[PDB]
Amino acid sequence: HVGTFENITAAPADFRADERPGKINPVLTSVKKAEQYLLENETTKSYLGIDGIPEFGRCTQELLFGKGSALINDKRARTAQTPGGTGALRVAADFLAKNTSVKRVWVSNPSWPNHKSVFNSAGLEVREYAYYDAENHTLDFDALINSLNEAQAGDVVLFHGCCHNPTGIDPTLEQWQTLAQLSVEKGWLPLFDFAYQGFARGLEEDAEGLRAFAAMHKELIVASSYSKNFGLYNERVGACTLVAADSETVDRAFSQMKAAIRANYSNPPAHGASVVATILSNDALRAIWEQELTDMRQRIQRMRQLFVNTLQEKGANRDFSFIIKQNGMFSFSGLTKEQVLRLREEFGVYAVASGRVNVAGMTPDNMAPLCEAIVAVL
Amino acid sequence: HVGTFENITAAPADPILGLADLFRADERPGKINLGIGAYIDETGKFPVLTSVKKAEQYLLENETTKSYLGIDGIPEFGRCTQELLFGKGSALINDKRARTAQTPGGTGALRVAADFLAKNTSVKRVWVSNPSWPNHKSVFNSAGLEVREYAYYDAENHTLDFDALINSLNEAQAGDVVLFHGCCHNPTGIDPTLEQWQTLAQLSVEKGWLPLFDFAYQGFARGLEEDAEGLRAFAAMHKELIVASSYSKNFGLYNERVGACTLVAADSETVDRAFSQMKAAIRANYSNPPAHGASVVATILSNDALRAIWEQELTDMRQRIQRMRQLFVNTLQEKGANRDFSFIIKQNGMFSFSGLTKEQVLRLREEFGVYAVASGRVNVAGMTPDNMAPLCEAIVAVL
Ligand SMILES: *Cc1c(COP(=O)(O)O)cnc(C)c1O
Ligand SMILES: *Cc1c(COP(=O)(O)O)cnc(C)c1O
């Protein structure tokens, strides 16, 4: 008989091996405290509900919309704990494809590559809208508006809550508000990918764009992640939050969302979400975490400044000031594929061929050799 | 405009989780939960195993990072999984024909296998036993596959209709997937004998089926190595098969979502090519798997001493369920049940088809606060010497 696995096609590809001296690319204290508390107080591993820990959902909605939000008081939002932000995006995609007339999702160009594959996995067409002005390293707002002209009512338009991946360029509050007005007028269904809350300016300031939409819309979806702002990457801690016009509608929709989860992974992993709930619902433990998050934010910004300065010190004629204005861990360096290729093979400095760099991996000890490598390929 | 969510139809009730939520809300104190498969101790608790608590303490004091695992998870987790499934020194491991991905539970392993097949092969159909775990159909349909049923259970005699099983599976074509329960068939508890397994493997290789093994209860039938004999008979013959296994129950790690999806192909090149598409299907689902539960499982299986504590804990779970099965039958007789319940002794695992009708199951819940699945399936692992008497009284009252 012919083998089923014979007609399968290899998967195109998405360091670690090369032994060259000096190649260039931890758990939070609050998380360790939380885990200790769980080790000695947990008495069972019984299945969570399909939607996970209820307190995890309450604290998620408060982070997204603000304590006392009209969405919370009117009980218009339902939150399911999911395996990571990615898992939240997949659950939303399966829910939309199975239960609604949604067939088309619009994502920024450029964007996180996994957006298209997650929505495609549910049979949803993914279109791109304009976003990045590579000339000025700014948000091309005019082109963004123009390119969303063909997004029909009932289409999903995906927005990054803050720290746009990969450009690090976010709409201003006024741009957010303009987008919120336009979104209501054209009947779009907003979906926010909110994976870096707290890494731009702060917890509350980073949710301003989402809350501008939340104030205008009857319906929206938020796929949030705690992988980065809690350092809980491999524990897979995220949330998919549904918002509808009223309590009866969101509950009706949320039961089909839970049906989509049941047929995917059944119920979500507890450990990571318990940590987050333990921290968020404890005043002193939350104060510790919030300070760790502020520390992380300021360190990245500090490295952004040092990166720019050392590029100049080491003789770069190109102006990299735009790195200071960009938010989060990722910025487009502006290096060509041919310039990135050299860094990988000729300097042990590894970056994506698109020239995206990860400020997280920069330190005061590797900054000098790193910048000396970049100035060489310029 | 009109809201996108305005016309969504409410989802129907889950046959298992629908009753579970209802049990959580029940006001009566004597309520008894015989619904969802979860091991309980005689103290009325669903405890964490001691082996697990020790491993969790090790992780707490030694883990220095939470950085993403690979798409396929912890390497040592995959190797220990293949040892349990196929046995240390198997030809599949030495020939490097097997690739394992850590998944969120055995359910997640089923969906990953289903997505992988739906998106990378010509598979359109999955054959599932009648009866079977209710969520099998939901998992396969959501990935785009049809679900067909093949004969299995003799209700009147409480046995496995092996002849009806083979005849029904003649409608299955080459390239179609056939799902087999490794051990402790859900919900009947009736597993094929080794000779019956070897006949299915023989017949499977001939018809060209793609065996899919759901292996959620390894160790609860007779023993770790013994419970894998059916699978290993298929492995010795087939060039290709898939195994979705779970550690939720044999490690008591239900809510950490610890499972594995293992691909087996003819040679190392074919499995690696197929496995790259499995990882792609995983990337577009949950990206990478949760570490805590799998780290616990890997830590236990890799330490000889810690493994011994666990394998003794598992052994204590298996034979305590065996003691409840015997007590269940003996108490039914003492409480006035006239019919023969001896078939319950022959059944393996946590679950047993009690023969109760849908209406009788409804009565138990409303009038007696005893919660079973509408199929008549009962969770023997939820019975205790203390709740056995009231639950048997309730059952006899509705007979
Ligand atoms: C990292 C990232 C995600 C996924 O986060 P996880 O919780 O690890 O799944 C989603 N969207 C963006 C933009 C990201 O950068
Ligand atoms: C319980 C069960 C599962 C689910 O295993 P999880 O690890 O909880 O996802 C899968 N298959 C069968 C037959 C089961 O009984």
Numbering used by the authors:
A (entry chain A): -2 to 11, 20 to 30, 44 to 396
B (entry chain B): -2 to 396
Question: Which sentences from the paper describe this structure?
Answer:
E. coli aspartate aminotransferase (AAT) is a pyridoxal phosphate (PLP)-dependent enzyme that catalyses the reversible transamination of l-aspartate with α-ketoglutarate, yielding oxaloacetate and l-glutamate. During its catalytic cycle, AAT undergoes hinge movement to switch between an open conformation, in the ligand-free form, and a closed conformation upon association with substrates or inhibitors. Steady-state kinetics reveal kcat/KM increases of up to 100-fold towards this aromatic amino acid, resulting in a selectivity switch of up to 1900-fold, and structural analyses by room-temperature X-ray crystallography and multitemperature nuclear magnetic resonance (NMR) spectroscopy confirm that the conformational landscape is remodeled to favor the target state.
We collected X-ray diffraction data at room temperature (278 K) for all variants with the exception of AIFS, which could only be measured at cryogenic temperature (100 K) because we could only obtain small crystals that were not robust to radiation damage at non-cryogenic temperatures. To obtain structures in the absence of maleate, we applied a rigorous crystal soaking method to serially dilute and extract the inhibitor from the crystallized enzymes. Superposition of bound and unbound structures for each variant confirmed that closed library mutants VFIT and VFIY remained in the closed conformation in the inhibitor-free form, similar to HEX, while OpenLow variant VFCS and OpenHigh variant AIFS adopted the open conformation, similar to WT. However, OpenHigh mutant AIFS gave rise to spectra that were distinct from those of all other variants, but could be deconvoluted to two exchanging peaks, to allow estimation of populations. We postulate that those peaks correspond to alternate open conformations distinct from the one sampled by the other variants.
